[PDB]
Amino acid sequence: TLVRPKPLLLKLLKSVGAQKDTYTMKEVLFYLGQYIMTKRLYDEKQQHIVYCSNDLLGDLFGVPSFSVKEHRKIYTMIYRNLVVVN
């Protein structure tokens, strides 16, 4: 199933090299994972902790930090930046 990232999210995804306007959820999660990893936003010691308070990701998610363990929260934050395609 396809999703359409809203503009700030799409800009983030494009900043890692993605070129599409329409993605599967798995693609969105893949590119967002690469973004977090390459910008080194994760905690060195507990690498499920992500710090986004001085990053585009923080504006997008509306939080200063989160843990990868917070699955529902991550999806909630993602889905606010996407439209599901009919």
Binding site: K26, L29, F30, G33, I36, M37, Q47
Partner: peptide, 14 residues
């Protein structure tokens, strides 16, 4: 686990 391994866990369940 590294961040990419945590990432990969989440992604795989999508």
């Amino acid at each position: 686990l590294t961040f990419x391994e945590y990432x990969q866990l989440x992604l795989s369940a999508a």
